[PDB]
Amino acid sequence: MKIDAIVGRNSAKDIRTEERARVQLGNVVTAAALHGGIRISDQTTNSVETVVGKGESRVLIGNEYGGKGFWDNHHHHHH
Amino acid sequence: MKIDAIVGRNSAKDIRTEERARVQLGNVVTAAALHGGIRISDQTTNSVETVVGKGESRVLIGNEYGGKGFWDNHHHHHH
Amino acid sequence: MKIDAIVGRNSAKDIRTEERARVQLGNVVTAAALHGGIRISDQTTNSVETVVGKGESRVLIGNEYGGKGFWDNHHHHHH
Amino acid sequence: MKIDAIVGRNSAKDIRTEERARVQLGNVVTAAALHGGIRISDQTTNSVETVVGKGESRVLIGNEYGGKGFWDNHHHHHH
Amino acid sequence: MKIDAIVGRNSAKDIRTEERARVQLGNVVTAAALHGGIRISDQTTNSVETVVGKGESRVLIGNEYGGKGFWDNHHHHHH
Q: How far is Cα of residue E70 from the mean position of the Cα atoms in its chain?
A: 13
Q: What angle do CA C58, C62, C65 make, to 5 degrees?
A: 100
Q: Which residues contact E45 (CB under 8 A, 6 or more apart)?
A: E8, E9, E10
Q: Which DSSP state fits E7?
A: -
Q: Do chains E and B touch (3 or more CB pairs under 8 A)?
A: no
Residue B6 CB-density burial (10 A; 0-12 exposed, 13-18 middle, 19+ buried): middle
The sign of the CA dihedral D21, C74, D68, D79 is negative
Q: Is C15's CB within 8 Å of A50's CB?
A: yes
Best CA proximity match to A65, nearest among C62, E9, D32? C62
For testing contact with chain B, the best of A18, A74, A77 (most B CBs within 10 A): A18
Distances (CA, A) of C53 to A75, B54, E15, E17: 20, 19, 16, 14
Of C44, C65, C68, the CB nearest to D9: C44
Chain breaks in chain A (C to N over 2.5 A) after: none
Residue C7 CB-density burial (10 A; 0-12 exposed, 13-18 middle, 19+ buried): middle
Distance CA B50, CA B63 (A): 18
Q: How far is Cα of residue D8 from the mean position of the Cα atoms in its chain?
A: 14
Q: Is D39's CB within 8 Å of C35's CB?
A: no
Residue E40 CB-density burial (10 A; 0-12 exposed, 13-18 middle, 19+ buried): middle
Number of separate domains in chain E: 1
Q: Which domain does B62 fall in, by range?
A: 1-79
Q: Which residues contact C65 (CB under 8 A, 6 or more apart)?
A: A40, C27, C28, C29, C30, C33, D28, D29, D31, D33
